[PDB]
Nucleic acid binder design. Structure first.
Ligand code: AGS
Ligand code: ADP
Ligand code: ADP
Ligand code: MG
Ligand code: MG
Ligand code: MG
Lengths: 312, 48, 313, 309, 312, 312, 312
DNA sequence: CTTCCTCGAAGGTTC
DNA sequence: GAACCTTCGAGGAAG
């Protein structure tokens, strides 16, 4: 498989990786389970992969589910009842599970037990069930949307961040060997620059560039070929996608840089307002291409010079 | 062969089919000697 | 041609058409099926017809279904057995599929096999179902509701776009030959300009013009008749209806461009709130004639110069 | 009968009437069925009446149902199975059909066939050439895919004084009542542009002429009858006049808020906004402003007050 | 009885009563059913009473139901079809029928037929049910809540007005003879002037005065007993309640007549903003004691001469 | 017990007691049910208590329910079917009923009948239910939410007032006798002045003082123990809390008495804008410590001398 | 275990402990339950622990739930039917309970009864439930957000405050005593100074420092080792979190110190307003880093000199 | 899925 | 320019 299995193979995330090593080995010296750990950050940074690495370093079998996959307390009760001592449970988008599901998790995390009422009318009893020692691993895209009392239960916080050019270039090379593709150190740098920090994007771009090089070339990925392929795929030199270019172009040409409301913009381009604000705007904000104001979004001077329009 | 028959019926039920309908669907298969995979495959193919 | 079979015949969509050619040829130069593909765009552009063309270019048979028709995992698994090695499965409105099946769908896509788990949970056993290689082609209008695991499986993305005048004009010409009518290129250009970029609208205008040209004329659509027909109907040269012109005029004449509330505007033109917001208002925003603000709608400078009124901030 | 049967009897609607004649004649010349027609607009303008005229001109038998009656897909499938070649299906209040039924209907409109599931069983149907006709007051409430399948759109408009004058005279002959040319014009001015309102006034005046007169409508009886009903020469009702008077005498023309005006006339807030203001705004007696609503110069001249900006 | 039964007994409402007489007489000469009638207006003015009087003058039986009772089309389809020629159907609180049911009346009122689905499954069919001539009568306080296509079908509209002192005096005297109490005409005028123009309030005051006159008096109502009883109830000669008087006094003694805001005034009287604006403010404005302006409420000269202050 | 059982035990509310006595006595002589009555006013003044007193004086069994306990008209019909002649039905917090149900009472209150739909659905018809004489009693904290047609049907209205020091002092003594404690007359007067004129508050303080006097004292609530106990609770000799004192102190120390705006003051006190206006400001205004003005609010001389600062 | 269980073990909160001791002891001489108690204040200070201590002192069982966990009245009714005489019910985040649920407590807390509709169809009937004696304990972050009728029924109030430097030092020493570990007084003081006066933070930091001292040190915590561990984590030398640095850095660089609206700041940093208002802003205010004014928040000079900027 | 209602904006007066 | 007051418009959450 492409994904790494041990801390030696996992490139980057030096801070998170360095912290986890100390805690994982310390837990072994005391012969006890690892404290509950929360991983968070932009999608595709490797949160899921890290969970598998932790399991191998611990020597445990991973179990998995997701917030949207759990809809009733009985589901989590069954899941938690289907646990073995030392097991590691990974829950994707732990913040999306309903408020009724967290009820079970608080006592499960802190005391490792659950309580279920039984009986009706004049009859009323409950069953208190002990849980074996386990390690919950949660992952989310947004930390501020997690339940405050739940957030307080996590003992370790792992903040993922974007990879730098040295790491992404090494990841591109690693993957290229699996495809038996010949790529020079120059071409690998171009893909790393325009993949805007995300390994998942780099792997997808590489496969698409390969198909072009196998026809419009002799199967050798040259820097000249990579640039021609990237323009055919409509990928900007700044890593702006087709949708990103469409947004900036519309604000400058139709609104003089704004201000413009999210609804008006989302109606001009055939997009859902919830998608624009969740998928695309976050990246454009972090790079300062779009700024938020009382009257709406505004394109900065940086955007004008990039697109090639004279600023006012 | 009752093990393969029960397995195929149980597997069909695991896909959400009703016990009665799954039993009938598998009961519609003639060959008992064929493996559960062929039974469930033939059952689903015949049910399409 | 109106019904195409190869990219050589499909009108428009040159961007997506050029990209798919390369990926299909690279797939043929190997013993591999085409990567899982996802098609995006507004409704009515031809996403379904594009699937038939890809199937013919690949030299494979096409299976067709829709998201709502799949209610349980057994439904999908049954269809998957019908697929021969390399077959293409097209799922329309894939975003409407149920979450219970989503778990099964992406699993088979990645592994080409399905594992079934049976038993009480304490004692359980698995069975392995090997599947032939296949290509899934999904079509959707709403993407922000697709789950992250599903999105990650699709390796190719294609965006559909509104047809431009040079391409939309040819659709009118080809359609005009199915019927028995002659049309001058200058007349065809006038219809394409008013078709809002949608083939289905261009056909509707052509049908209405045909009726006039054979009752009030010599059965030929010349530039003179097209102007008369386009005058009986009130479709403006920009594609604005009679009500659309009344909306813009009212905002400028009575409210000085706004801001004006939806309720106040509705009672002036004598229409329901839901009718102005869903029938007429959507197209006026795309053309940039109005904007939506916290305090109401406002007309832009582009509207003033189109209606012919002087503009002042 | 009250409802006209042919275009020669159908007064007004020159735009919609002129267009439909062209399309019907072309369809007959080709021996083809008419494209699907959608009729929409304000209440009482003639939408239902026009649907029957279209059938009489085409020379077909009309099937009639309504959206509120079709509650499940099985209902529609049963209805469609009875259609014969060239038949016309008319669905009133089409905006009420459930979304599960619309998905079935817009497919049959394009391909004339059905393949649907309905202890469940599969049903497949091949439909002959037919024309669907729909009438609604909330055209925006239909799904965007469905609207795209209609081939003809008819938007209704209000009538002019010469048209309503002729309609009043026609209805008077059905009631075998004698009415003068100048008396008919006095009722037309008060009918707000709607045929249904014009017919209602004639009914109320007829009852008065029979009890308080000699059973004949003349310029003198019309003045007495209209004075009893208290309908102004501009069509304003007793409460409409009270609204304008209050604004001019207590707030100097405004601006004033809707809540303040409602409490001063002892009316419910939603009754003033939805029952009385719509006509006053369309006729130009009142304007809405960011700070309230104000009476225009036209209101001052009508009520007889000295205007001041 | 307490509800008048014929136009001879129905005091007041000359405009509505005069019109209905002409239309009922004209309908009888033609031997046909009366057109559909809608009655609307403020509470307690006689809407429900007039509905019965119309039936007595028409000489037909009345079928009665209410808006809250009808919940599904099957109910209305069951009430219909049970009508006989010339029947009158009365629906009280017609404004709270479900909108899906109002649209069933569109055909019944204009053309006397209903599209009915008949049978079940494969036997399901559509047939025209057909109705005999009938008169629908509706009563409501919220006419603006009915749909525009429904209001357009009512052929007669009756808007009710408030009564005058002479009419209320006669109503009090009549009620004083349903019970067994002697009342001086001078005292009857004293109660009428305090009943705010509404017959229900006039009857309520009489009941309270009767109780006092037979417990703290000789069992007869005279100017002496009326003054004592009205002093216990604390109702001013203009009909102002204890709280009404407190509001005017506070505005004149602390703010010099205003302007003052509703929030500031409510806190000074220990009342809450929503009761003052809904219970007390309406009558004070309609009778000219208070004036609303862009800067707040202001007390008029009429309030000064009523409370006994000087309009400086 | 804590709740008075008869009018001879019920202290205060002289205005309401006097009226209710006359109406109850007159009802018995005629052998009739009492007219419907509505009790309303500020929280904790004695509304629920009065509803039981009325039932005991009439000598009838009381049926009890709750406004929010009724969810649909099917519930209300079932309740009304249980009424016996002369029964009293008490609905607490009647303002929480849904509008669809509130409109069913209109017929029941005026004519003692209800229209209902019955049958399997294939065969169904409307029928009248005829109810025996009964008295509806309602209590609400804010009548402004009740619809105009409902309030018009209540025949007797009772508006509750705040208690004065003479009357409130007796309530403290009576409660001490139930607890079998001994309280000095001067100490009872001290608790009343700090109870904001509300009986519920006076009872709460007495419980806390009683607990203290028997844990660190000799079992007597003398004037000396009261001061120590009240100082521990942090209740000023005028009933102001620390937050209330902080406001008056800030206005003098940072603004010289104002005028100052509410938004400005809120920041200097770390209090929420709307909370200050609704939670604390009302009592301070009614007692005369703060005064609203067109330019802002001002602390009166009374606020200066209470805080010990020098007035200027 | 870690959580204290008796007042002799519960460090700090002297003001709350002193009061609860008196009332708990007085409540034992009499044979009755303790009055309803409301605990409120910043999160993580130990109010949940206090509920366990009260139950252990009273000698009864403790049942736990939360407002968000109750969705409809039937849920709460089922819980109340499961209480034994003298039991304690603890409701966390009581201010977030839905209004339909809250109004059931008004009768239960004051009179120990509930009115409920039971059955369906013709079997529908009203029952009057009578509850056994019990004590409700509520916890909330915003005391000013409860409704007036609810807050008026709680008989005891307990405000909680941040721990001082000497108190946290003992908490660290106690925690480091349950675990077999050795900590120097100077290191324990430094670790407490970083803990924002919050015991939950102090316990979490100590656990991580212990892991580091076992792997990167000799198994003993010294100021040199503590500083290294605390510097490997994102804990600033004065406790600022990475979330805090982002806030101050964003305000100073993107808004020039403000004034800035908390809403626009929250959306620019992508954080929930409630978290900054309840968890972050209060500490930044109580330490002089953030100032506030009606226009908005302002960054003080102390913030500029800490982040390394120039207070221009 | 729809009606009610509550939150935010800004126009206008006054000191 | 700071503070009060009224009015309008678009969300959103509780039927
Ligand atoms: N006149 C009184 N004499 C003695 N105790 C009284 C008196 N009035 C009220 N109380 C007591 O005050 C407490 C609260 O009275 P309630 O009647 O429950 O208040 P309330 O009107 O019900 O408040 P609500 O229902 O929340 S609006 C009870 O302990 C009563 O016994
Ligand atoms: N540091 C890394 N080293 C190797 N592969 C990586 C790394 N980060 C991401 N990838 C690869 O990119 C994809 C990341 O997917 P995943 O880890 O599920 O992303 P996330 O969990 O962050 O959404 C996988 O195919 C994975 O193998
Ligand atoms: N006074 C104290 N002594 C010892 N430990 C405490 C003290 N206060 C709090 N803690 C510890 O810190 C945490 C407090 O959590 P909790 O009591 O739930 O706070 P809250 O109720 O505010 O959420 C627990 O782990 C508890 O053991
Ligand atoms: Mg019609
Ligand atoms: Mg009535
Ligand atoms: Mg009460």
């Amino acid at each position: 498989t492409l994904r790494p299995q041990y801390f030696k193979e996992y490139i980057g995330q030096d801070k998170v990786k360095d912290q986890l090593k100390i805690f994982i080995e310390a837990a072994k010296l005391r012969d006890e389970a690892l404290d509950h750990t929360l991983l968070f950050g932009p999608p595709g940074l490797g949160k899921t992969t890290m969970a598998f690495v932790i399991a191998n370093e611990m020597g445990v079998n991973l179990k998995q589910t997701s917030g949207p996959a759990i809809e009733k307390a009985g589901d989590l009760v069954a899941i938690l009842n289907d646990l073995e001592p030392g097991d590691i449970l990974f829950i994707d988008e732990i913040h999306r599970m309903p408020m009724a599901v967290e009820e079970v998790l608080y006592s499960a995390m802190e005391d490792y037990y659950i309580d279920i009422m039984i009986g009706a009318g004049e009859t009323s009893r409950s069953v208190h069930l002990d849980l074996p020692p386990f390690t919950l691993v949660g992952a989310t895209t947004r930390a501020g949307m997690l339940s405050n009392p739940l957030r307080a239960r996590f003992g370790i916080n792992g903040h993922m961040e974007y990879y730098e050019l040295p790491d992404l270039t090494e990841i591109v090379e690693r993957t290229s060997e699996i495809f038996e593709m010949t790529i020079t150190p120059e071409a690998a740098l171009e893909l790393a620059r325009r993949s805007r920090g995300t390994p998942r994007i780099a792997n997808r771009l590489l496969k698409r560039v390969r198909d072009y090089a196998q026809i419009m070339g002799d199967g050798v990925i040259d820097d000249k070929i990579a640039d021609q392929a990237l323009t055919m795929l409509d990928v900007d030199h700044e890593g702006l996608d087709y949708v990103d270019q469409k947004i900036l172009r519309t604000m400058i040409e139709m609104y003089g840089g704004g201000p413009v409301g999210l609804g008006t913009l989302s109606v001009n381009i055939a997009e859902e307002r919830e998608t624009v604000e969740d998928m695309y705007e976050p990246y454009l904000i972090q790079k300062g291409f779009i700024m938020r104001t009382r009257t709406g979004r505004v394109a900065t001077a940086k955007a004008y010079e990039h697109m090639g329009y004279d600023y006012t | 062969s009752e093990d393969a028959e029960q397995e195929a019926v149980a597997a069909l039920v695991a896909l959400g089919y009703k016990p009665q309908e799954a039993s009938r669907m598998v009961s519609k298969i003639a060959r008992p000697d064929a493996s559960s995979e062929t039974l469930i495959r033939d059952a689903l193919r015949a049910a399409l």
